[PDB]
Amino acid sequence: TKRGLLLKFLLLGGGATLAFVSSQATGDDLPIVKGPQLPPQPGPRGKI
Amino acid sequence: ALRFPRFSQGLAQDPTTRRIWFGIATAHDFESHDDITEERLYQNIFASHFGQLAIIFLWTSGNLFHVAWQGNFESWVQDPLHVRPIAHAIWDPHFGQPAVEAFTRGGALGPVNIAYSGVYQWWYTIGLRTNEDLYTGALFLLFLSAISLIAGWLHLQPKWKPSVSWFKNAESRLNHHLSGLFGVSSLAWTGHLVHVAIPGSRGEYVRWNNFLDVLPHPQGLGPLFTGQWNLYAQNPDSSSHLFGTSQGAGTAILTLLGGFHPQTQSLWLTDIAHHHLAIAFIFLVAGHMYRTNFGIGHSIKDLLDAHIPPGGRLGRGHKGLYDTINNSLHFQLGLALASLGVITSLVAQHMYSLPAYAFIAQDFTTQAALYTHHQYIAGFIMTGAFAHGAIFFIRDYNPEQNEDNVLARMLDHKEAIISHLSWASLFLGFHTLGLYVHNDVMLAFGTPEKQILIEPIFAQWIQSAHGKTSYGFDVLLSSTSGPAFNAGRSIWLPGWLNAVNENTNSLFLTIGPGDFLVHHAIALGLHTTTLILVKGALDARGSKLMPDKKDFGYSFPCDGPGRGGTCDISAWDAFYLAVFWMLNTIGWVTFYWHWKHITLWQGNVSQFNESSTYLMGWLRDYLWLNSSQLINGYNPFGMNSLSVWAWMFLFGHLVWATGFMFLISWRGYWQELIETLAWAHERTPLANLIRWRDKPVALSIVQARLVGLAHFSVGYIFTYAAFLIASTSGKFG
Amino acid sequence: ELNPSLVISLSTGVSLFLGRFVFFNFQRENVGKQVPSQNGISHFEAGDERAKEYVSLLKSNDPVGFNIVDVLAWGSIGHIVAYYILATSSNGYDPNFF
Amino acid sequence: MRDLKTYLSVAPVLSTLWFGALAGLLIEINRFFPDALTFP
Amino acid sequence: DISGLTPCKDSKQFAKREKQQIKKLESSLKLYAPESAPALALNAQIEKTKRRFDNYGKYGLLCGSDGLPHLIVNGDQRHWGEFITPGILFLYIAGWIGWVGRSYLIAISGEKKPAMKEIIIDVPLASRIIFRGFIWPVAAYREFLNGDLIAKD
Amino acid sequence: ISVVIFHFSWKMQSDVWGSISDQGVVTHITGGNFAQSSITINGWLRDFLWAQASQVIQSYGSSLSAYGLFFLGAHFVWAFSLMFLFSGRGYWQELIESIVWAHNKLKVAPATQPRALSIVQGRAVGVTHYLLGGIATTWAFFLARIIAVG
Amino acid sequence: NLPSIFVPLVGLVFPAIAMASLFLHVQKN
Amino acid sequence: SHSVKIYDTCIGCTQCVRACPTDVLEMIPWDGCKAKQIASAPRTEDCVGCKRCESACPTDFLSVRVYLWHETTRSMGLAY
Amino acid sequence: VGPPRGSKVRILRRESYWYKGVGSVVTVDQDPKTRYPVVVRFDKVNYANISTNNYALDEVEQV
């Protein structure tokens, strides 16, 4: 019920929780964490 | 002012949402703030320049850090023709697995973006080779940004504030900028080129830890202080030289070869060093012109006052102009913006035809992106130059102190100027459009031989004067027995002529009837844009419809519905109108450049030669033909790496369309609609418990024009950027 | 084959002689009419204390008033000419006109 | 009669008559001298 | 020739274009009876194309590497029929029109309500004025010397 | 109305109109691509606007050449309308003030004083040209496509 | 390592804190 | 509050006053014109800025001038 | 006092629509307390469709 305390607590704790959850995500939850699984495609004129 | 903005008490008492919108939009207009003085104005501008420099340094440091951290620079410097440079990594939680697979390019282990800014080639050319070099460059740039912020804070303190008289010492600042900021910087750059870059291109690795132990030249400063400077040019790199290695490497540091490097297809490094040394000498000499403290030099005021023709045709000549220029920051800003906009286009036109970076020329996407980027920047800067010139006439112009000088006579015959500009623009538009429509009608009726195809003979003759032999004109450098060719026969003409007559680079491309029409379209666009801007600037103080326009400021909505109607009568509205024409003109030149280069890179210039003579050719063979790969970035069968550009294409279309709303619909309709929403909120249960604190109102008349123009420009830029990058990256020319 | 010391000394001497005996009057009568000023007054009078002229530096006991600044200017011109001669004579440039 | 002649002298009627005559002249010239790119 | 262009009587691309146009026209001829009116109309088009190409050959036009005529404007004395003579004729017609307009505007200026002769044209007065443009260069020059051309404000 | 007619055209070309052989097999004009492609804006851009405009843009030199010309003309008129829609008469009256000076210098200034169009009239001209250009673009594109492929 | 932590901070948390602070600033007095 | 000003080119035909939608202007005695009256704007705090007075101004140039200034709840015509 | 009635006069007021033009004097007020006594009629209408205006004695030149 302290509005000054509640705003700071919500903002800081929510940011910390968001960062922690993003840092604890596995490859099953996020494709970006899983990473590529296929051999890479070549370029239009032989560039890699 | 008790609320926001604190610099405008009148805005602070506004009980509507307009208090916020305007507070953001007038933050940097220091001249119109409450209790402003000239000293405070100059000091605030001086402080803001340091912050701008700090931001510039931070941006470059970020680019260097990300290239060193997530890029493939070390693998790229070993295969510049087959490795795609990486800008930075991608971490988006919204990505799907096919997106993760498709964006894994280069030799990276995850999604990445391919850099099209050309930083890799630029950094490779100047000697940087390892990731640690980029890491230590980024730290230095961060240090510079911090020091700029510290200086900006320091010169705002009571004991370090500079006075107005110091800011108005034009002679000393001109001397120091011409001699130190331009001359000495160039000398330092050619020193770097001689000590690091040139050795770097021959396999020598020179850094801070060993540059005091390695001789840049075998003779070591002997010839320089003796006078036989030719010893620095005797043995240049062979034509079989491979960049970065010692195979075919010479010992010269300052040459005048001309042409391009056979392997890298770029300018010789020694030529660049010699150029910068010559420019440093020129600027150092030029920096000793004005009188500062030692009893020698010139006074700009006396120079301007003495240049009055005795015939009286220029009136009082340039008398008094020193005070108007020195006491007006808008005059200075307009001059600076005009010059900078001219040289931005100069850079754009010179970088594509005379590449200076190793292995840039055969990186087509980077070249196209750079040319478009710099031309659009120049287009915006040139509009700014006229906008601030118009602001000067309202805020800073003193008619009594400028009696009958070259600046008052412009206001005297503004009508003659505007009418003649209008005639030129009308003539160009009429005849260019008529010829285009005639050719279109001939092509529609199956008779392409009835087209009006005018040969651009003046420009072909100019090209032949530069040594091009594709037209058989035999003039000046194209001739063998002339004095002009005989003078440079053994200095630079061999290499320059070999590069010019090489028909697969961008040096003096062959032109035909298709170029003649597009060049006149560009001329019409230029003339119309200058017409709008000049009419706005010269009518800023008033006209017959509004004799007291200077009494209302640079930006006001209107004078009302009386006297027939006064829509878009302010000088700001002239700039708002001219931005559309600038965008159209730059789009024309960029379309021309892109279509002329994409066909040359494909090996069939005849596609452009025959299809550029009528506008349906432009619509079909340039826009429709080259959008097949881009619009297939994502389809019901899958996606590929071009999906970002496909999304951005439609994003730009949507923003461009949204701008039409603000540009077409006007305020009263929206205000009358917002009233009903206010009633509805005030009568809705469980929502009466929530009340707004700023009264909701529609956007202002001038605010809506700015918002619509911003949406229009953002869509215009993004749509073409996506199309250009995707079309040049689907096939790589 | 051109002696650098002889060329530099002769060019500096000629430039100083020209500045002291030939072009002195024109230069002085022209600097007399060109003094930088803002809003009708000099930069120092406006309030710029860094723009004050160095009276103790420009004074000299020369019979016509030749001072160290004139020496520096004319010597710089002479050195530029001398090094132009040395750099233009060492190279084997031949404009093949005839 | 006088009023009808006054009406036939109004701008749109005179304009359509003049441009019709011009169009007919140009059409007949192109019918008898077609495909002219130069002036011999 | 000029600017690397070849005359259209020599260039093979011009003849190839002429052959392909006739071949395109002759493909639709196969769908009609040899005596029908559409067959008679396509034959007239074939003759028109042949005459056009023969004329372009005879007039001495220059053709590029695409088989299409190219105009020469710089001022070459053997190419005046493409820009110079037509331009002179245009400048004679346009000056005629401008001078007849100016004389009519001057003639009605001194009346009670001169805006009524600008929406309802005095046709006899226009008939009087119209044929004065045949000598428009002489009069336009002569009011330049005297000073009746430019209003000195 | 533009969205309605686009919907009608794509649906009829994809799921109703077509050809039938003497085997009992139906082949539609666009092969039933509406269901999976008309659900994205990119689908409308690619499979409808880009794909079906291929007729009107290659109609030059044929009997349908008048539709490409009208296509370009409609685009031109639609773009022309934006000059009237985005500006106001205060700029144009001031611009006319300079041309009137040039006419007065040569004694060719008309008695009927030139005026910029009224505020309401400019809106009417802009909307009329906008509608004409937009409707004519679809007229030409639809007619060329459905005559060539229909 | 770092991107998984930094991207949510710059894209969500920092804009939220800045928006809250700016709103409280503009609603003052 | 907007700024409304009156210049002595007034001919005193009272056209501005009866065109005011918020009763900002009024007519006061004078001696500089044949009508012996000039316009005044004593209630510019009720000005909305519609510039209806300038549309009714017969003088060339205008004798009544409206300059749009700081915005209040009265000047924006807000009823909520 | 003032130019004779019916004469032709050039306008010197900068903000006037007929600046540097020519009009005809209709009446001139004789009251010394009148600031702009010269009434002038013009052939062309201004942007407000008005053909008459009052000018001071020093803004009018007899031609």
Ligand code: CLA
């Ligand atoms: C030798 C002494 C010296 C030097 C080096 C400078 C240097 C500078 N002064 Mg300065 N100043 C001096 C003496 C000096 N001043 C004196 C004596 C006075 C008092 C009379 C002033 C009064 C003064 C004021 C009042 C202001 C400055 C400002 C500036 C800065 C300008 C912004 C900038 O970085 O532009 C950089 C400019 C260049 C590098 C040269 C132009 C380069 C061209 C346009 C491009 C061509 C280069 C090349 C082709 C491109 C590179 C390609 C690739 C590398 C990307 C700059 C750092 C301004 C500022 O921002 O201060 C914070 C400012 O407001 N000065």
Ligand code: CLA
């Ligand atoms: C060295 C360059 C320079 C400098 C120092 C200035 C300085 C100034 N200009 Mg100026 N100007 C410049 C260049 C410059 N300008 C150029 C190049 C143009 C042409 C485009 C203009 C056009 C211009 C106008 C028309 C006006 C000024 C004004 C001003 C003054 C106040 C600015 C202000 O309030 O900012 C406020 C600026 C903003 C709030 C910026 C708005 C945001 C813009 C639209 C960017 C939006 C980008 C968009 C969000 C991207 C979206 C991406 C998408 C993916 C979402 C100030 C003295 C104003 C003034 O007071 O004049 C008397 C004024 O009316 N200038």
Ligand code: CLA
């Ligand atoms: C494609 C759209 C388009 C077109 C064609 C134009 C055309 C023109 N603009 Mg413009 N403009 C546009 C969009 C466009 N604008 C937009 C979006 C804006 C932003 C609001 C502006 C803002 C703008 C400003 C601010 C200015 C112009 C000016 C001009 C004129 C420049 C002179 C010229 O080119 O003469 C060539 C003329 C043309 C190409 C007009 C077409 C003539 C047709 C083809 C001939 C007649 C055909 C036929 C006989 C008519 C029959 C139809 C009917 C009778 C049945 C010209 C009329 C300038 C101006 O007035 O200078 C004189 C000027 O100051 N424009």
Ligand code: CLA
């Ligand atoms: C008497 C006819 C006449 C004459 C002599 C001129 C003369 C001139 N005009 Mg002009 N003009 C005219 C009519 C005329 N105009 C009309 C009717 C319009 C409205 C469409 C314009 C609109 C116009 C603009 C917008 C501009 C000029 C400009 C100019 C000047 C440069 C030439 C130019 O650009 O031409 C171009 C002329 C046109 C585009 C209009 C031509 C219209 C037709 C051909 C004229 C027909 C006149 C009449 C119907 C015939 C009289 C019949 C009578 C015997 C009964 C020049 C002084 C330019 C200027 O001031 O720069 C110096 C400029 O920017 N004019």
Ligand code: CLA
């Ligand atoms: C850089 C900006 C950014 C970032 C990093 C994200 C990140 C994310 N968005 Mg997202 N989004 C953004 C901008 C951003 N968004 C914008 C601008 C829009 C508007 C167009 C959207 C619209 C959007 C939608 C519509 C959806 C997402 C979803 C997601 C999540 C997808 C991952 C997943 O499948 O796990 C899913 C994981 C969960 C559902 C559990 C999350 C539990 C969190 C970690 C608890 C912590 C919350 C914390 C206490 C609150 C802090 C607030 C802060 C102010 C302090 C991910 C967290 C999707 C989702 O499910 O997220 C809710 C989803 O449906 N976003």
Ligand SMILES: CC1=C(/C=C/C(C)=C/C=C/C(C)=C/C=C/C=C(C)/C=C/C=C(C)/C=C/C2=C(C)CCCC2(C)C)C(C)(C)CCC1
């Ligand atoms: C409005 C205004 C303003 C502005 C203006 C402007 C913006 C302008 C622009 C301008 C411009 C933008 C200009 C440009 C120019 C350019 C030029 C001038 C160029 C030149 C060149 C040359 C001269 C060259 C020559 C040559 C050589 C040397 C070599 C090669 C050959 C030749 C021969 C070509 C101001 C602020 C002032 C103020 C007032 C108002």
Ligand SMILES: CC1=C(/C=C/C(C)=C/C=C/C(C)=C/C=C/C=C(C)/C=C/C=C(C)/C=C/C2=C(C)CCCC2(C)C)C(C)(C)CCC1
């Ligand atoms: C006292 C006396 C006398 C004497 C005098 C004298 C002897 C003087 C001298 C003087 C001198 C002796 C001077 C000098 C000067 C010099 C200078 C001043 C120099 C400068 C230089 C420079 C400037 C350089 C530059 C450069 C460089 C750095 C690099 C290379 C290139 C160049 C060259 C560019 C007498 C007897 C007469 C008499 C009386 C007494």
Ligand SMILES: CCCCCCCCCCCCO[C@@H]1O[C@H](CO)[C@@H](O[C@H]2O[C@H](CO)[C@@H](O)[C@H](O)[C@H]2O)[C@H](O)[C@H]1O
């Ligand atoms: C106004 C400031 C003073 C101006 C005058 C300064 C001196 C002018 C030139 C005088 C003669 C200089 O002559 C030149 O000196 C340099 C400096 O050592 C020598 O340079 C020599 O030592 C330097 C380091 O000390 C080495 O980097 C170099 O490889 C070596 O050659 C040259 O071998 C000699 O030819």
